[PDB]
Amino acid sequence: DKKIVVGATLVPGGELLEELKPLIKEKGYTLEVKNFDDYILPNEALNNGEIDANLFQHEPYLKEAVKAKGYKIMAGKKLYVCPAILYSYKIKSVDEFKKGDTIAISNNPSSCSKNLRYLESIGLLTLPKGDGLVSPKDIIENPKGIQFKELDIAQIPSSLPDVTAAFIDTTYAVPAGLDAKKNGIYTAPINDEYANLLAFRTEDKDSEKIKVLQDVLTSDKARSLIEEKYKGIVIPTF
């Protein structure tokens, strides 16, 4: 009734929501955060009706989820970007890549494709022109003989000792104890197309609960919380 149940991955959405509880209480609502540890279940729960909203994804991921699963869900206002970061225990600069080196990448086709294009933009390889999805099979030039290890996203943090470098979502990196200042060698450009945001059932588009959530999530308090906790790795888009 006056309870809002939001599903979220701990970092950054879960902890942001937790610190916004008092502000939500000021709007006359109680907030409960349901923790999820993966990118699949939060949307199921949302479409099932178990949660009022979720905070873990960007709109492109949601659109792909809607296409594959037929969820009746929707992206809200852009909140913050979480640029992909390339981590390494073995080198400090992308200039230090050499023959035989291995990069761990997600087996998600969109993430994989996007990661390969990041590596292209820094001159490490070349891909065919266009905007379609690319894979390691499509690499035209590969000067430094970089091999790619395609893994489940949950496995990538623990792979860092066994590979040269790895692309890891901040949602996975931070709870795994990875420090981007210490071990990050490349951060992806800011692109608000990939801004994480609140998602909710299309039916609840104009409901007060979603309205309350998006108010507090775009507040000055929300901005300062993001900046104070993540300092550079999660960037507000409001």
Residues within the annotated binding site for Zn(2+)? Answer: 15, 37-38, 52, 203-204, 220
Is residue 43 involved in binding ligand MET (CB under 6 A)? no
Phi, psi of 191 (to 5 degrees): -145, 105
Piece of the chain touching ligand MET by CB under 6 A; list 126-134, 169-177, 200-208, 216-224: 169-177
Question: H or E element: which one contains 217?
Answer: helix 208-217
Bridge partners (DSSP) of residue 105 are 150
Taking the least distance from each CB to ligand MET, the nearer of 22 and 232 is 232
Q: Is 183 in the site for ligand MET (CB under 6 A)?
A: no
Say how far apart CA 24 and CA 15 lie, in whole Å: 14
Q: Which residues pair with 106 in a beta bridge?
A: 151
Contact 163, 156 (CB under 8 A): no
- Shortest distance in whole angstroms from residue 100 CB to ligand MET: 28
Q: Which stretch binds Zn ion (CB under 5 A): 27-35, 106-114, 152-160, 211-219?
A: 27-35
Binds 38: which of ligand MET, Zn ion, Cl ion, none (CB < 5-8 Å by kind): Zn ion
- Reported as half-sphere exposure (CB side, CA atoms, 13 A), residue 1 has a value of 0
**Does residue 164 touch ligand MET according to CB under 6 A?**
no
Nearer to Zn ion, 142 or 207 (CB): 207
- 92 lies in the site for Zn ion, by CB under 5 A: yes
Among 36, 39, 186, 230, binds ligand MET (CB under 6 A): 39
Residue stretches of the annotated binding site: 15, 37-38, 52, 203-204, 220
- Pattern 75-94, binding to ligand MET, x per CB under 6 A? -------x-x----------
Measuring CA to CA, which residue among 229, 190, 203, 232 is closest to residue 78? 190
- Two tokens, residue 70: 């037929």
Work out how close the CB of 193 gets to ligand MET at its nearest, in angstroms, rounded to a whole number: 11
How far is it, in rounded angstroms, from Cα 212 to Cα 24?
Answer: 7
Distance CA 125, CA 135 (A): 12
Single out the segment in contact with ligand MET by CB under 6 A; choices: 66-74, 131-139, 168-176, 198-206: 168-176
Interaction of residue 33 with Zn ion, rule CB under 5 A: yes
With CB under 6 A as the contact rule, the residue among 97, 194, 200, 230 that binds ligand MET is 194
**Alpha-carbon 175 to chain mean position:** 13
Residue 197, both tokens: 């945001």
Based on the shown chain and the rule CB under 5 A, indicate whether residue 33 belongs to the binding site for Cl ion.
yes
Residues forming a β-bridge with 58? 196
Sign of CA dihedral 117, 119, 123, 128: negative
Q: Which residues bind ligand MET (CB under 6 A)?
A: 39, 56-58, 61, 82, 84, 169-171, 194, 196
